[PDB]
Design an enzyme around this catalytic site. Sequence first.
Site, PDB file in Angstrom:
ATOM      1  N   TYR C 120       0.833  -1.210   0.000  1.00 16.04           N
ATOM      2  CA  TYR C 120       0.000   0.000   0.000  1.00 16.04           C
ATOM      3  C   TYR C 120       0.862   1.253   0.000  1.00 16.04           C
ATOM      4  O   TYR C 120       1.994   1.219   0.497  1.00 16.04           O
ATOM      5  CB  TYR C 120      -0.946   0.056   1.210  1.00 16.04           C
ATOM      6  CG  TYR C 120      -0.317  -0.052   2.572  1.00 16.04           C
ATOM      7  CD1 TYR C 120       0.195  -1.272   3.027  1.00 16.04           C
ATOM      8  CD2 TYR C 120      -0.317   1.018   3.445  1.00 16.04           C
ATOM      9  CE1 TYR C 120       0.718  -1.412   4.322  1.00 16.04           C
ATOM     10  CE2 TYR C 120       0.216   0.897   4.749  1.00 16.04           C
ATOM     11  CZ  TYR C 120       0.721  -0.331   5.172  1.00 16.04           C
ATOM     12  OH  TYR C 120       1.245  -0.464   6.427  1.00 16.04           O
ATOM     13  N   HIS C 143       7.422   3.159  17.106  1.00 16.78           N
ATOM     14  CA  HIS C 143       6.603   2.345  16.215  1.00 16.78           C
ATOM     15  C   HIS C 143       7.365   1.101  15.783  1.00 16.78           C
ATOM     16  O   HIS C 143       6.792   0.007  15.694  1.00 16.78           O
ATOM     17  CB  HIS C 143       6.116   3.194  15.030  1.00 16.78           C
ATOM     18  CG  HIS C 143       6.550   2.713  13.683  1.00 16.78           C
ATOM     19  ND1 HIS C 143       7.646   3.238  13.026  1.00 16.78           N
ATOM     20  CD2 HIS C 143       6.003   1.811  12.837  1.00 16.78           C
ATOM     21  CE1 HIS C 143       7.776   2.655  11.849  1.00 16.78           C
ATOM     22  NE2 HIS C 143       6.791   1.785  11.710  1.00 16.78           N
TER      23      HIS C 143
END
Lengths: 221, 222, 218, 221, 222
Positions: C120, C143
């Site tokens: 994506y 993250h």
Amino acid sequence: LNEVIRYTLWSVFKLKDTLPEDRAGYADEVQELFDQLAAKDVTIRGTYDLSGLRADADLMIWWHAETADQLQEAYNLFRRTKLGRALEPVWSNMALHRPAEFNRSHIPAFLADETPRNYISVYPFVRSYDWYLLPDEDRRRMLADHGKMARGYPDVRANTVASFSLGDYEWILAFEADELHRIVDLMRHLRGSEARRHVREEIPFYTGRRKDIGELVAGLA
Amino acid sequence: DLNEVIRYTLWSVFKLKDTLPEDRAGYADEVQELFDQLAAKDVTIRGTYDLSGLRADADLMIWWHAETADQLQEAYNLFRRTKLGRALEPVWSNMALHRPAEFNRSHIPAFLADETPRNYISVYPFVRSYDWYLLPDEDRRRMLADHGKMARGYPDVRANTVASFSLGDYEWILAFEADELHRIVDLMRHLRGSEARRHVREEIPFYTGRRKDIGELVAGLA
Amino acid sequence: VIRYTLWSVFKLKDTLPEDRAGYADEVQELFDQLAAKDVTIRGTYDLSGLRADADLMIWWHAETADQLQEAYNLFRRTKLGRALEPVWSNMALHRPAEFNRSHIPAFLADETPRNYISVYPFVRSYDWYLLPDEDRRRMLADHGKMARGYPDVRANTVASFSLGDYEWILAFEADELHRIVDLMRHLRGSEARRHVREEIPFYTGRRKDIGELVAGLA
Amino acid sequence: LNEVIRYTLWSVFKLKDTLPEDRAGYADEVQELFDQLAAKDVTIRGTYDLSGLRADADLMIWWHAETADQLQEAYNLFRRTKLGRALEPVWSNMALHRPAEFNRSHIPAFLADETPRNYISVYPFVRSYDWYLLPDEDRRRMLADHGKMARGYPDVRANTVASFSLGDYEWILAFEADELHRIVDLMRHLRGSEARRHVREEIPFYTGRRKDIGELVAGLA
Amino acid sequence: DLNEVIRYTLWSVFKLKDTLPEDRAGYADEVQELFDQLAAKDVTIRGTYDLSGLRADADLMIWWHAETADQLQEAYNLFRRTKLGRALEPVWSNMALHRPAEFNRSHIPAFLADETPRNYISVYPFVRSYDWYLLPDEDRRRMLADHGKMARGYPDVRANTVASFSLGDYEWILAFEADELHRIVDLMRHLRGSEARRHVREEIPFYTGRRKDIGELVAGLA
């Protein structure tokens, strides 16, 4: 004059492909219809070459009449012509002239005797959610300051016509000018009005060269 | 001086309807003939560009410019009549015209200055925030100046930011030219650090590709 | 240094023929000639059913954008290519990471392709790159460590500024599909989710040899 | 009457090209089917000419029955007529009258069986995410205040019908009046209601003229 | 424990290219045969639904699930090879996968607990706000609990809300089954009163239809 009833319909078409190499009578047929339309009070303010300035638009027709019904008839009659059958409907919105909120002398050029010019820049408009909820003074001020900021451009003629519940928009705008770059500088200059802070949508622009249906048909691919 | 020329610039993007035929003998030649004829009027063709593969719905971009919009319109429909043109669907065609910059009138698009077109291009439209042009003149000035200052390490990348208000859906069409593709990449990533980034509503679609002669382009397309 | 990477997504015009004798071999032939020219075909993926407007994806990379452009047109000339519609084709280019420079895409580190993929695009917030470096450093570090428990999902995040409509292109490969899903869901807890504008379309699918892929398609 | 289960479906179509010049059976074959469906409880409140006012709509059908399945059968049958095999479906959303949240004598003007007027504008509606979380007072007041504002426009009949999870929207809206310009002024006037601060979507609009199927088949290109 | 099962669920929506033939031959039966063969391989086909009329761009839905994604891809391509398949074009096909609920490990999609398919389905994707998963746990836990409580008057409406992160454009695929269509309408409008409504970015397209055996589905269609 804030008491006429006139419906303006700008309707945009794009070539299905190219027009044929032999297009004898395409222009003439459409002109024929444009005249018997002019018999009835259906006036064709202009047709417009939009090629190349948009990839999905090629021809525009500006018509206006006293009822929405007459325009609908005109639209379908055009689509039956040999040209309309080689075009695909792209965008076609109608608006209706209403008195301006405040300045009731503000009148669209097509209802004020004005001549049609060489270039046109047509586009819908939709204000913020709270434009019309504002204290009347604030909206009359921004609407007046915005008209001042354009007083340097009387060579650009304005049409700003209400369209609520005639389609997806609140307004349909049309600008007429002999010189195309004067439209550009008008828009650029008017990015300076405080009214710009109350805009939700002004796309799609359709901009083109006013032409005679005879040379318009010859110009198109 | 050059801020007083009227030069309309048009970028026209096409995609194959499907594929060029196996024998495409007349195709590039017929298009070069038209480009030569357009060059007799002042309709200059700054370049054709191979976009295939870098975007699924774009294969070819013609960059052309001239003194009236009408000549571009004429050139455009004339292209769409060529054998190459009839194998192509229009996708995105937007016109712009140089207006004097607001603060620094020595900012001139590269095509205006008759600069040399480079090997690669990325073209894309641009729309500022609603309150960009309303900001006090000092704040817009030092964001426009700071951003050009951040581009100093990339003199090999040649800007063509051009006004387009009411020619189409945008405020500006941008075209960046460089001989090495990754330098365009590296310039944008670096310019993401400019405060003007907080005054952006729209900047797609991007059309990036390789500049090629029409003969080589028509050969390499599917 | 300097590898361009391209993900090309197609969908069927309708179905393939009942008699599809040539199709896979013809494509494998071209993939072989490109690998000679150092155009790597890292995988072909079956996307059908998981998206209505996507059926197959090709992941290929090379030293220049031009070789990929050439590969892409050659593929559109095969029989399989002529039975397909281009849907979404986006290139990216690795650039060294802003903070931790050991962090490189899996396909540059030569790791094997896994069974499944989800590809994506990514566009960060307008002010993400304007933040103080220590803030962005913290959010990228955090993250990334939230992902410690998913070492079976291999990342390939690759800069794509100015090549198309996006800033990054992302490709996750794992042997079990549901592991990708749980990774995604667990990272919705990273603070960097506050700095996202766009992360679609997703193309998720099964890695397959071109032979097996042609036969399974409608 | 807040106890009647009534499903209402508006079905918008557009021409694939144009009708033929020889359209003998067309208007009749449809009008038969309408007669049969009205033999069941499938009322066909109106057909509408939408052409020219939108480039991608030409015909709307307003039908309603006691059950959603009846409307589904009606739809597939109509798409089987010669007129229906000449149309692409464009937009077809169903709604179902539920009691109002506050004023239970607000009831769609179509299950208070009235007269279909000449002009309709139909559009979907989605409120702000927090409209329904507002204290009952505030939402009560705004809906009441917005109702007052439309007093001056009683020749415009409001149908506003819940639509949650029958489609993308929260309500379908249909407005019918005999004078088209009166819908325009009502929308403009109502942009002064406070409920305008709690709107996320209100498009596409489909506006047009109520017409009898034979007259409408002849008018379209 | 149903929380340890792996079951991929796929909703596949199709619209007619034009209209079906008059002579629908064995259209219904060829498809029913394939469902039976798939049933043999533990590819469950929970339902086929008549979407037509309630949406201009959808006429048919298939709800199928299995233990691997790959089995559903094969089912999907096989269906497209049927005569009915060849008369449709794909519109929207999304897959999801049950994962343990964040807080209440007793929330389980209906199909995974092998409940009975009801007469009416409404299917739609869901994407939460960007900070939704970042709220402190007790804010999010409270909001989901309260949204459960608000649905207690609707046990006749079954929920199948299932994770879809990375499988497509969304976070969840939702499927609500009821014997009366108006109960779904009423549940939706009732749940607009939950605080979780402040944390929603996307929830369309809605595909809402009537469950039908293949035979009468194929017959009622245009």
